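ERR on first pass: missing label on line 2. Operator R.T. fixed the label and resubmitted. Corrected input:
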Amino acid sequence: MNKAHFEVFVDAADKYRWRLVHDNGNILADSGEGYASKQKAKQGIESVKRNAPDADVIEA
Amino acid sequence: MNKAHFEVFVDAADKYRWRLVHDNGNILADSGEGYASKQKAKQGIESVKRNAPDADVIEA
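pass 2 clean. output:
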């Protein structure tokens, strides 16, 4: 029912990162970290999809 | 079934952002955005929970 998709790309330091983008083109989320493997980047996405929908937001 | 939680904080420019952190203490995701409203930060989280678990990852 959503309109969005993840995209893994390379950082300025040749690192694998990702960002979630809505149909409009706004950044919804980002990997936060950077790594030297595309797999790990994708693992971050799957890690978030497995925690994000249940994780509670607190104001630090 | 998970171990994580969202946390909203201030950027170097007085902006409200957030990051998802697992029990391990690793950054799973980040807002990617940065704005002067705490509400917007939290809106980003809810928006990601509404797109992330359904969004498909593309390797750019």
